[PDB]
Design a binder for this molecule. Structure first.
Ligand SMILES: *[C@H](O)[C@H](C[C@@H]1CCNC1=O)NC(=O)[C@H](CC(C)C)NC(=O)OC[C@]12C[C@H]3C[C@H](C[C@H](C3)C1)C2
Ligand SMILES: *[C@H](O)[C@H](C[C@@H]1CCNC1=O)NC(=O)[C@H](CC(C)C)NC(=O)OC[C@]12C[C@H]3C[C@H](C[C@H](C3)C1)C2
Lengths: 300, 297
């Protein structure tokens, strides 16, 4: 009945290593003969306010990096920096390398996080990228380099690497090319995320899920244009819909026979009038962290 | 965050088991595959089975076990309560250190939901006081297992067998004994009245505080017995002194005494949340144990 369901993590567990500079240890991702990790592994507690990463890296050699899979050292044979990620070339190809891709996700998309410490997995959980490019994770000291991913058939799509916490308790990070999601930088400074908003496309997915399960009191007789809906949505701190959102609701629209813009008109009415005491899927609150793909998985 | 254990050690044990047109999942440990015995039923048999009768009519060769694209040869079979044990001629090199445990109501575990021998998703479950689990399971999910991991050791505690009309789920331990008053027959079965896992609600209120949510705290206090009277009135489980002790570390971390947090929960039960939320929830959450909360700090 709609659990937060993560992808099986084994294919990613088989790629996790630890990377140490000095006493600073974080996690890395070992794929083929390259290890990827956050570049702030090279910082000391004095570099961290505004590190000159290019200068810090010049002062490093291959022999300054301790890369371990469990207790077994992996020899580093080259090093480079790509945006905010370090790439360490190693002399061994990971025999557990899955089929994989590096992908950049959009806000509202969900993914699984394998939270790791010292290269060892602790737990797996499902996260949504918020519209302000933060995630509500569970991350302690030593969790950096933990990754987020989706799995399609045989293929692991890596989409997130963890780098930092914001003063509000939420989390920020990069894709596997080292480019931050959102307007954040890897400096130990207080950084503010944009005001967050509700993930409209996911709320619509949730409403389709309710219909699929026979809970449909909120369907009305009307429709809306996408532009009219977007202008109303923003007044309720809901994200505007994109053309890609309309398209990814296609399968659920087809399964239910309810056109996307008709469901938008139903959601608009819910926003303007409230639930009037009623519930949807046994909840007085609308859920915004299940995507249309996440619904289709658990329903059908 | 509801957090499951990493599922890799279990993924390496999942296989597909087929008898006739009935297919489900099995757990391959060393040279034995464990699976629900109703794999031997036709969909018709499932409506009311005599399992010993059905099993005597089966040979080793009626069981098709597949590990990916690779068929494993069954060389023996036996039934233990509601689980079938299929001896195969190949040992699983991916077998982790493991044990079989029977969990108590209120304890939590991770489920690796599987279809056709292939893992699909992982999530965290509590054994309800009425011995159901609020799972997410579809056709073909039987033989999926629940587990906890301690160090390198996988403790298997649940194997999935059925759904109830209310949409909750029922199954067995790895010795084949059901949790609760349920039977592996395709008939509508109701559970006993469920209750809320009080020690877990308290653990989660402490998690709300640790993450800076304190609107529900108060200065009232209570004795253990007076709290338990109110708890029971609201269909909450009694809190034992062992529960109070288990909460100690969380009490120390936050500096809120257990019975003080009991007084906050009493006020929530009597007054409600007044449209407010705790850790984003409009309802009190009871599927995090104290240990779950600590581990995640
Ligand atoms: C890498 O393991 C950690 C992950 C952090 C630790 C706790 N939760 C996390 O998500 N990353 C960092 O420690 C990171 C390092 C820099 C990018 C070089 N720094 C960081 O996350 O800063 C957090 C704070 C939050 C507020 C108080 C204080 C000063 C700033 C505001 C930044 C730390
Ligand atoms: C094994 O894969 C399935 C898992 C079930 C299917 C759907 N969701 C599940 O969790 N197990 C069975 O199909 C099981 C077989 C018996 C143990 C022999 N039968 C079952 O779960 O029946 C569920 C229903 C629920 C209501 C409608 C209908 C009649 C009864 C009430 C029992 C099926």
């Amino acid at each position: 009945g709609f659990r937060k369901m993560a992808f099986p993590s084994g294919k990613v567990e088989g790629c996790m290593v630890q990377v140490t500079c000095g006493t600073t240890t974080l996690n890395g991702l070992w794929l083929d003969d390259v290890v990827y990790c956050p570049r702030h592994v090279i910082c000391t507690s004095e570099d961290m306010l505004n590190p000159n990463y290019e200068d810090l890296l010049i002062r490093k050699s291959n022999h300054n990096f301790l890369v371990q899979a469990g207790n077994v050292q992996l020899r580093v044979i080259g090093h480079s920096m790509q945006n905010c990620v370090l790439k360490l070339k190693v002399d061994t190809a990971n025999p557990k390398t899955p089929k994989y891709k590096f992908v950049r996700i959009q806000p509202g998309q969900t993914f699984s996080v394998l939270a790791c410490y010292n290269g060892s997995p602790s737990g797996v959980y499902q996260c949504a990228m918020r519209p302000n490019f933060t995630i509500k994770g569970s991350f302690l000291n030593g969790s950096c380099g933990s990754v987020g991913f989706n799995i399609d058939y045989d293929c692991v799509s890596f989409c997130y690497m963890h780098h930092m916490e914001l003063p509000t308790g939420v989390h920020a990070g990069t894709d596997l090319e080292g480019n931050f999601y959102g307007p954040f930088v890897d400096r130990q400074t207080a950084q503010a995320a944009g005001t967050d908003t509700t993930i409209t496309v996911n709320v619509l997915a949730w409403l389709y899920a309710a219909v699929i399960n026979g809970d449909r009191w909120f369907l009305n007789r009307f429709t809306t244009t996408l532009n009219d809906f977007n202008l109303v949505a923003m007044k309720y701190n809901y994200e505007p819909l994109t053309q890609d959102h309309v398209d990814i609701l296609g399968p659920l629209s087809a399964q239910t026979g309810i056109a996307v813009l008709d469901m938008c008109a139903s959601l608009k009415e819910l926003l303007q009038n409230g639930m009037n005491g009623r519930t949807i899927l046994g909840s007085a609150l609308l859920e915004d962290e299940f995507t249309p793909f996440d619904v289709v998985r658990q329903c059908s």
